[PDB]
Symmetry: T
Subunit: 134 residues, 12 copies
């Protein structure tokens, strides 16, 4: 079982210490320990994210998805996640509820399986672990 | 190394998915020992009772996993008692509070919580425990 | 048929003071009225009052386990509690929300209820007569 | 003596529509009379899709000072004219809804009438017209 | 004259994890009461039912209440309704300034039916309120 | 310690259409001040600019303010920023209970930057504010 | 010139049977008609509870290019149809209300008519209609 | 096949540039060519409109409806239309979204099959043609 | 029979582009029309809210009617509303232009709920008509 | 007599996907129907906003009508709107689902205030009717 | 060319104890900083401060009667005064709204200006340079 | 010392389709040089291209002048990119965003921008440049 980890705009800037690279590695280590294969990609492009989403729908694979700012603004991304037949675990590194009010809304939580927020980089790992079971 | 798992109003009714509360306590207790932790699991429908327990977790500096039930959207009192905690606080909803009624999408707890796990059913707890075992 | 009538916070203070509202029937009288009417309708009616949320829920859980119907006047909780709603949403038997006053002729916040959407039905603003009428509805089913 | 029971837009389509309960307006009209009659009352039961017609009926009830049981259909949530007419009723006015309006769209959870009404019965279905009658039967003010 | 000072949720934890613990508040209220020539009873509970009970007693005893409701202030229609019954004065007391915290603390279900409200003059709101009452 | 008591629009009209009038109020306040080993300057204006002038002076002099802004309470940003400068305590006072009136009287621009707020305690509010200042 | 005075819903119920808020509809027609006489205009005063009926009278005025004094009662706060009918008028339109709408329920503070009318008189009692006439006489 | 076209309040006063009669003519001419029968009526009276809606419900015939102002106000009308088992196309001649803010809400749209706005008079004809194809 | 016609910020500027009566012409036209009705019109304008309040206070104590057009303050001043609140004689709010045919913000008046009546969009004429009303009550 | 049919994000997943007509299938009908009407139909789909804008910039430059089903971008993009606002010839907004019968947030669009018109809830055929409208200017 | 610079309430308090801040260039040093940079561009800066709305309004009128440009920092009034807005709206010559601090980084109430929609433009957050950038704009058109 | 003038969606299309984007680039450049800075001006319709450019200004600690277009009102991902700048960022708009539609009166950028200039036409760009010369 392949799991798709899709980091959205800005997450390449992670740590600018836990860099995006340290994230990618860290995820693959728990991935392989869980008897899973994680494919982690990031892009600042909404088009690109939509497309990785489309693929994972065609391939019936779960998606762990940290969309960054697009979480609060984008119906298109929501609509592409809605076709996922497999589980979708939305993730935030930071507690989105402790910050600005507009971050407390997510177009994604309603069509997602579960949501992990403010647990730091481990959100992802704990998400993989869930997807091991379903 | 104690951990407090606290469940509020109505959680005493799980299983009437099919996991009873009695069952879930056991799950957590066992899962917790596997990670070297000691889980104290408790449930009450009484908002005062949850306060005494959250008060004790403040004094002991023990971490809390809190599923507050309906109190999540409603009790500013609970929030305040919780804002006092110094060890982590992980808010947990069994169901995806975000795919239900509009009013379940506000939490009073979330802003003072370390983090929040939603929609992952019973595993939400075991995950919270795992995070506690690392940090 | 056992019918549960559950009254929330402050309801033990009926008619005795707040006598404007209200109306003038004390809680003890209301118990008697409701029992009397239950008898003519051929139902047994257990009536119970409490300012404690934990106690109301525990009565509602029991109602849910017995699949007995419920006539609930939740007091202030109507407008505020989600736990209680969540308890009530569990009942298989019918749920009738009763308010003595006309919650729509008063403060704007009384005009909203967490309970109303998950109840069979609602009676508002007919005084103590609203408990008995609700009994009537159950007698028919 | 005399209660006016009034039904606004689309209650002529009761039944029937669709169906969804099965009771027609014609049968509901007979049910209400029967029931009123069993109580010592006489029930004049009309329905109209015309707001003007409804205001004519309400005016008369006011001039005669007869009580009014109103199920105003969609008009519950939109009509300020209907409201100001009812407002001048001196006899009890009891607003009715067959279905639980708080269990539906949001625009349904506001009534222009609930505040100027004696009370409100919602979601006890057809029986809500009879229970209204029983309230009137047990008073005269 | 007996004033009733009723502290709500979390208020038993003052001083623990203002400057002043609940014990010292009690100690202070006692002296100020004796300065004023009143009797005051100070009570604290995190139970809303317990709170309602005490208010009821005041309601039947025609006695003044000083109420610091904690979070219940912003959320409880039950407590507002119990309090609206009261015939002697009710003064709502907040130790912190509520209007300088989160936006939701700026709404109180009590202010509308209280005689008045003292906000964010710290523990001295209790004393200043007992004073208002001593002068009725 | 000098204390400023500042009174905004309409407060000149107290008791002209309860009872107690502005002159009388000045005097009770003056009386309470002396009794508290304090000196009180009470003033009244219907002019926002004049009120700003008085607030500027009290910030320069680092003197305590007791402020009853009247209608400006719910409308003036300008007034709020003047008051933001005070280093000595600011106490907001309303004679009436502003939470049991029109909805728009329940928003104050001043409360958030005030030390505290006393509402609905009548004229006694001023004298509870003086007494608060009189401690620390 | 001619001036149309139009009263909507519940307005035939003026006076006693709605005490204060004090004249009957008939008496109001008498007042309005005599004041128009002196002003040198003829007033056509009609009341109806039918939104349908109001629109036709309103269409007829847009046709005749006559001015309109409208008291729409509760439809003031609810009816787009009625507003779109008045939007059509080439002569002046004066909304009238007998009571002060701003001193009652919140929902009365909004008018769908106001933005398309020439003006609005509110709370001046029955004189509203007369003051409105006076306005029209002058233009 | 029968298609009911219902014009609401104020529609008897068109002039698009065409008058209401020019409009019946036009919907009839077009209705013919698609192999349909269009009944086109107009009332300023809600009662009449609800009645015309009931008939169409009973006879299970499609409805093209331009409710005018009632679009934005009437729960009664919306409930009458909810009864229909055959399609209902809501139709506004002007672009209701390029005028006042209130015109941008409709009670009918959520219950209709679809909506056509802004295409002028010719919007009736496009509705007719959708119905040709069912 | 004295009548207070009080005008607020900016009405000094009636001029002047346009919809073409000046303030001085307004005062005079109002003073002569009030005399035709056998009243005395006392027409005063200020940009100063305090000045406006002072004149409300006097009208309160004199029990004289007030015609007020409070300009921008209509939409913003609780202070003014509260001065107006205490009048005992009639208070007619007037606006020259149709306030409802304009910015959303202009459609709320703080004075309306405590006034006797309001007249809006009737041009300079709204004044004259409020004098007529005042002659009767 | 050229007409642009632009389809925004996700629309190339038609009939894949809530099984009924695929995107290629739909390009086909539109040309079939367009020809039948004596106009030429250029039909594009893209998930990238910047690309959709390019196409809109091109249509405005060309003075050629557009028929736009913007997908999700309908409810969120101001930049899409300003692009579209530049067209001097008919724009027709089109949706396949009835946007009003779903989530509240689907019920506002940034396009409708600048579109020539809107067609909603009428399936693939909406593209066709838009086309038909356009073939009369 | 005369440019009128106008500062509303509290701007007399710049520098000390201006806070802000906590400095601090003093309203006097500002006047100096502006007439200088105005001369350099060949303009005449008439810089004024008043805590009094009626005073502000009157400076606004004369500018209108004189067709002269205005750079306005209206302080608290920005957010609250329709009177001030309407005075400014009669300006034939340009109007630039200047705020020293970044209004969008402070309280929500500061993010609304009654002045911006009738102003040529607004400069915000750039400190005391805001005024000079404003004179600059005016020196071109 | 480098200033990064960034232009967003539809801004490629100033001119007729007076100043074109071409002319605006020359103006910015002349002015910048006449002030002792070099202005790198750029346009894009692509949210992802602008983020990229922002990230680079963050890495260089170079100031940014940004006219984000309609993305001013809608993009939180853009805002977060700018939160990262340690040097000044001036938001620019040619038109008056407050004299237009209501939705244009909210900026996700304003809060994190050092400053904001609005409605001063193409000149707003050069005044922002001037601002930066003197830090
Ligand atoms: C690089 C950084 C600025 C931290 N990323 C983000 O933008 C964001 C982080 C998040 O995804 C996160 O917490 O993982 C939340 C989201 O609201 C925000 O857009
Ligand atoms: C056991 C049950 C009755 C379902 N508890 C709850 O009411 C609730 C549970 C939740 O916390 C939960 O998802 O775990 C959500 C909350 O909104 C809800 O009120
Ligand atoms: C005895 C009294 C205090 C009046 N009971 C109540 O609290 C209440 C009565 C109600 O249930 C009632 O109207 O029946 C409504 C509720 O809003 C309110 O809190
Ligand atoms: C317009 C009409 C068809 C009458 N609508 C109804 O039937 C309705 C049913 C109800 O009246 C009813 O419960 O009887 C409630 C009301 O919201 C709704 O309008
Ligand atoms: C406008 C003005 C006349 C000043 N109003 C008052 O007097 C007021 C009195 C108060 O300050 C007071 O309670 O003393 C309350 C305030 O809301 C009100 O504005
Ligand atoms: C005759 C009476 C029932 C009093 N009329 C009215 O209700 C109404 C008329 C009004 O237009 C009026 O004041 O003239 C106000 C409106 O809100 C109300 O519906
Ligand atoms: C005055 C007239 C334009 C005739 N009124 C209408 O017909 C209307 C019909 C509309 O559906 C239409 O544009 O076709 C829109 C509606 O808001 C408007 O009231
Ligand atoms: C002198 C001028 C600027 C035209 N006046 C006004 O702005 C105003 C006067 C008004 O009373 C008026 O319409 O007459 C109302 C108010 O909204 C507005 O501020
Ligand atoms: C292709 C699929 C993702 C199923 N469609 C849509 O969700 C959408 C497309 C629509 O433009 C459409 O109905 O064609 C509507 C819009 O709300 C939504 O983004
Ligand atoms: C002098 C100082 C006290 C800082 N002035 C201000 O309060 C203000 C001035 C401002 O225009 C300014 O930013 O310069 C903003 C405004 O919101 C605020 O009231
Ligand atoms: C000039 C044009 C190409 C139309 N640009 C814009 O769309 C925009 C420019 C703006 O940033 C501007 O004018 O500076 C405002 C913004 O809301 C809008 O998106």
């Amino acid at each position: 079982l392949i799991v798709n980890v899709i980091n959205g705009p800005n997450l390449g800037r992670l740590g600018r210490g836990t860099t995006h690279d340290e994230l990618v590695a860290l995820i693959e280590r728990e991935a392989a320990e869980l008897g899973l294969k994680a494919v982690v990609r990031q892009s600042d492009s909404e088009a690109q994210l939509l497309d990785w989403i489309h693929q994972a729908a065609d391939a019936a694979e779960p998606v762990i998805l940290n969309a960054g700012g697009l979480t609060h603004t984008s119906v298109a991304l929501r609509d592409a996640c809605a076709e996922l037949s497999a589980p979708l675990i939305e993730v935030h590194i930071s507690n989105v509820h402790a910050r600005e009010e507009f971050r407390r809304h997510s177009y994604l939580s309603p069509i997602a399986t579960g949501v992990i927020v403010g647990l730091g980089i481990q959100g992802y790992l704990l998400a993989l672990r869930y997807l091991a079971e379903h």
